[PDB]
Design a protein around this ligand. Structure first.
Ligand SMILES: Nc1ncnc2c1ncn2[C@@H]1O[C@H](COP(=O)(O)OP(=O)(O)O)[C@@H](O)[C@H]1O
Ligand SMILES: Nc1ncnc2c1ncn2[C@@H]1O[C@H](COP(=O)(O)OP(=O)(O)O)[C@@H](O)[C@H]1O
Ligand SMILES: Nc1ncnc2c1ncn2[C@@H]1O[C@H](COP(=O)(O)OP(=O)(O)O)[C@@H](O)[C@H]1O
Ligand SMILES: [Mg+2]
Ligand SMILES: [Mg+2]
Ligand SMILES: [Mg+2]
Lengths: 450, 447, 118
């Protein structure tokens, strides 16, 4: 029983490592300084297990970043200046590192091994931290511990998310371009290549709601911004097998559903609210409900003050159940929060916009985000909304792939000949033309028609 | 005994390894003496044996004699100094322990740096001694003595490697520059060809080290114009073109490029309604682009100036330089250290891009948006003040070009299909305007 | 008070010399250029503290003497309309009498007005 713990302590206390790969990376850089650009993309100083190798690698990094030639003497002088040469094993050990790896062109493979070992080392460290938190919660509830575990594991995965993206040569872009064209040609392209908007005129200009697109729908209050976005959701839910995810930060799920019922059933929204539904109204609502229940392809999250991380987490959860998502709608971008950027609202909104674009690319799903137009527009009130009206609220234009504005002349001019008509202005579009689409606005039904 | 000895550092700064590498390196090449002799002197060596050896190296090379292990050993033997340096074996060891060439200049700089610190410590001790024992000198005299001795150390390292400041250095660099211009074909273009004759007449091409700001209101063809400059650089230069597309994906930039070089309707490319002629033109254009392989497209979002610089250096190392660097929208870049101030953040990005242009000796084209205040006026052409409101980028730009289309503001303009390129600022040429044919269908500017 | 100040000056100088010596022996990652800049900065700081020490009392008799000394110097030098550094522009020299010593001159212009040229 006394010989059992010594072998177990030696085999369990040593984390995964590769001293040989670490030595080969260092030795290889001493042989060919030009490989630093590639090696620096794979490994960081903290990726090394051995303390002496971290100090040596830090020296290598400092010399090469300064544009100085990396050799045994230069590195030794660097470490000597910081009184770290004795801590790494002396000049003899540096010479041994250069001697023990006479082979070049394999340095990238050794860098990947060092990075892989560091990843497992970080994973074990996180597992121990989570275990410690589980044993000693220090006042944290189960939900907080689950969120902590998810956050720490997600951080490990995020670090290894886009590791080898640097080199972007024309041959690679041509292959991806042809692959994309091939995919479009294989799918039925009768004017719509993405998620159907339900509006022919809009689809003619946008070719549908594209995957990976961050779409900003902006309007002044009561222009039908929520109404328009919901019609896009309704169309995606009725035409796609994949689910629609709605983050209703302003309105409750019951209210969104009631408006949806008013829209799909073409029943007066006021009648639904007041309960004065006739036999015909009940039959239409019931038929609509029957279809919605048959489809079951819609999720409504009415949680307030969600962070981009929480939005991403919930989206991934649902996407895993169905092998993807048809559309993600975020009710009001400005209602989201970023605890790290509370000191600056503009930067906070800019980060939310960047995070939602990253979410769109990550899940290959169109992300519709609703935004409010700046108050300065009402002072002018002479022309249609423009991109500058949104720039004043967080520079969201830079991250958006598509910007759509909602304008109703009847709101500003009740005697307008365009009563019941809403203009959808394309303010920005990466994969199509800019312009305007006229839609029939039916406020009583909370619906837009072509 | 050891505790007091460990705490006391009586050994001045030195690098025996660098000294050996300088000596060993000269024994390997001889031609590097001219460069090494500019950085180090015999007295710069800490070690007595290395000073004697280096003195021997200096005497042989100044006499025009070949420097080898035997010649140096015979030289030292004649002066009975061979035993003082460690014998022939030590000379052979010096030649053996440094098998690497092209780093001798770096070792020479280390030896010179150590000698500088050694002289500084000596002066500090002299000043300390003068402070303890003034020998009749007042405080003012001691301050003047300290200033004089420190100024003497600084003066020795003033103008070591050509010393750019004095007229003799500027004359040499001026003649070298003229010589380089005369060796290259100068038919009106001394830099990177813009592809527009009228523009080249005014700018003499896109110069190396220039930070070029291309600014325009939305839909004026800002991206289109910058891309035509990239296309021309890619077709006329052997060195690669690097594009940082922060707003558009690489596929979209390529599709617009295909529309431009092939003169095929951009809408047709998008819709796929290409006729036999359209396919033949696109295919021929693709064949050439693939043959050249001189273009890189980086579509990463929110890049920092450091990341931009890092990627640019990586590519430049593969080809011995770059023909042109294009950064799609300056305002889309980020500086984590300056998040509290957008104006300062943009100003730092502009300074960093100018530093990048000088560092790699490459023209850097950066696209910028004109301020919204211009639309409120809408009575005249864009001016430099329209850009100053967005980060004071004018101060750092070597060339500022504005894009103006009268047809956008006035659809009934007689200048339909014409875009005016306004030179708002130019360091090495005149200011003015160039009229170009804007072909929106092809995403192209023509002369 | 002057003796106490003089002694303090030498005391600070010795302290700085020891700091520079310590930095020279132990550079802690600083290159020679950084150590030279550090030495220059610390020595310059000692000199700057004793730069304008007795300037407080400014009585009219002292100002009159300096005024007359200045006038005397101007009268000894050829003053054919230029008392300072010649601008090369007669009309400008007529108004400025040249570029005077101790003057901070701000030349301001919008871009391309020829500010650097002037
Ligand atoms: N009972 C109703 N009858 C007619 N129109 C209604 C009724 N309820 C709401 N509306 C209209 O529906 C629209 C709701 O706008 P909404 O999307 O919620 O605001 P926002 O643009 O701020 O997101 C308004 O144009 C409003 O006039
Ligand atoms: N299919 C098309 N047919 C005609 N003109 C087009 C087409 N697509 C784009 N354009 C034109 O190309 C230009 C694109 O401008 P762009 O450079 O992308 O914007 P910015 O100035 O903001 O950078 C506009 O002048 C637009 O009218
Ligand atoms: N080749 C040239 N031909 C004519 N005028 C030129 C030429 N190059 C520069 N200029 C003029 O020289 C001046 C340069 O201005 P400058 O002093 O550099 O700018 P700033 O006022 O911002 O300091 C401008 O008025 C410009 O028009
Ligand atoms: Mg809403
Ligand atoms: Mg662009
Ligand atoms: Mg100037």
């Amino acid at each position: 029983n006394r010989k059992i713990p010594d072998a177990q302590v030696d085999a369990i206390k040593v984390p995964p490592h590769s001293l040989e790969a670490e030595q080969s990376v260092i030795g290889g850089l001493l042989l060919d300084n030009e490989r630093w650009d590639t090696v620096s993309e794979h490994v960081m100083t903290q990726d090394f297990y051995s303390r002496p190798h971290r100090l040596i690698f830090d020296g290598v990094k400092s010399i090469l970043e300064a544009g100085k030639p990396l050799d045994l003497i230069t590195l030794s002088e660097y470490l000597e200046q910081r009184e770290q040469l004795e801590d790494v094993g002396g000049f003899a050990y540096l010479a041994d590192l250069a001697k023990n790896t006479p082979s070049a062109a394999n340095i990238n493979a050794y860098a990947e091994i060092v990075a892989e070992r560091a990843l497992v080392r970080n994973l074990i460290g996180v597992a121990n931290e989570i275990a410690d938190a589980g044993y000693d919660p220090q006042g944290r509830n189960a939900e907080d511990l689950l969120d902590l575990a998810e956050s720490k594991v997600f951080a490990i995965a995020e670090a290894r998310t886009s590791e080898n993206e640097g080199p972007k040569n024309v041959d690679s872009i041509l292959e991806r371009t042809l692959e994309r064209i091939e995919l479009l040609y294989k799918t039925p392209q009768d004017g719509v290549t993405g998620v159907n908007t339900g509006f022919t005129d809009l689809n003619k200009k946008t070719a549908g709601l594209q995957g990976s697109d961050l779409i900003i729908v902006a309007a002044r209050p009561s222009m039908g911004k929520t109404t328009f976005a919901m019609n896009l959701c309704e169309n995606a839910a009725m035409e796609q097998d994949k689910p629609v995810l709605i983050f209703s930060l302003e309105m409750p799920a019951e209210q969104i559903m009631m408006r949806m019922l008013a829209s799909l059933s073409r029943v007066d929204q006021t009648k639904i609210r007041t309960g004065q539904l006739d036999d015909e109204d009940w039959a239409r609502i019931s038929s609509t409900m029957g279809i919605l229940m048959e489809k079951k392809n819609m999720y409504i999250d009415d949680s307030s003050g969600l962070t981009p991380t929480e939005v991403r987490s919930r989206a991934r959860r649902i996407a895993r159940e169905h092998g993807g998502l048809s559309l993600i709608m975020v009710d009001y971008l400005q209602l989201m929060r970023v605890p790290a950027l509370t000191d600056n609202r503009t930067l906070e909104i800019a980060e939310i916009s960047r995070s939602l674009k990253a979410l769109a690319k990550e899940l290959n799903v169109p992300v519709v985000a609703l935004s409010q137009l700046n108050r300065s527009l009402e002072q002018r009130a002479d022309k249609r909304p423009v991109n500058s009206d949104l720039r004043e609220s967080g520079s969201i234009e830079q991250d958006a792939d598509l910007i759509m504005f909602i304008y109703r002349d009847e709101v500003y001019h009740p005697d307008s000949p365009l009563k019941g008509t809403a203009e959808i202005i394309i303010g920005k579009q990466r994969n199509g033309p800019i312009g305007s689409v006229r839609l029939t606005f039916q406020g009583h039904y909370s619906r837009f028609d072509n």
